[PDB]
């Protein structure tokens, strides 16, 4: 992944 992509959970 791009390091600046979403690093958080998908609810």
């Amino acid at each position, epitope marked *: *992944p791009d*390091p*600046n*992509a*979403n*690093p*958080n*959970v*998908d*609810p």
Partner: antibody
Amino acid sequence: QVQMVASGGGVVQPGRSLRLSCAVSGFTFRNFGMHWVRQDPGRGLEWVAIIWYDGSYEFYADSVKGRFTISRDNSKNTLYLQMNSLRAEDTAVYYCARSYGSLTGDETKYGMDVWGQGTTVTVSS
Amino acid sequence: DIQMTQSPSTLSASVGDRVTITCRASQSISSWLAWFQQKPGKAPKLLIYKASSLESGVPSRFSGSGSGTEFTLTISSLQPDDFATYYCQQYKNYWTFGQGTKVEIKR
């Protein structure tokens, strides 16, 4: 109230090791990516490492690649930075920072929002 | 590495003045620019995200504008709690910061 505190800093000689930890409060730790950021004596800020929410991906700055490891214990809600082969240039205050707390997915690039209190690391012969 | 540059490095101002700080980027970062505030001895605080969006509870005396390579933080009326060092940060390719702009008290 989203709040964080880094600890574990100290004074080591070049080439030795040090482990930093970060405690959190007021948010669900296992749901957000975490950063380590440091601030050099010249008040300059530089990013160190990022870890995904589930620990599936870790990215490091070129200065610390191979010597530093970022990790997390999503059950104890703790962020870790293990350092070995420390250099004098690593002398800084190390902060932990949460990635921007959006759980929507609308954006394509993500930064940081909440920074914890820093811990001081001094590397000198 | 996308290089960030701020101007000025030090800014003398008085309470109630309109203060403007500029941030320049070596490459077009679209609107992925953030403004942080850091008071001495404390950790930075996020004030403005996505170039122009104020965070919750940030006073509306703060404003941000710009896109591409030139960005601007404007404080419409400097209050005593606004004397600090302000950093900009791009979050397009990794995360890099400006050197900081110190807002001091003019006497």
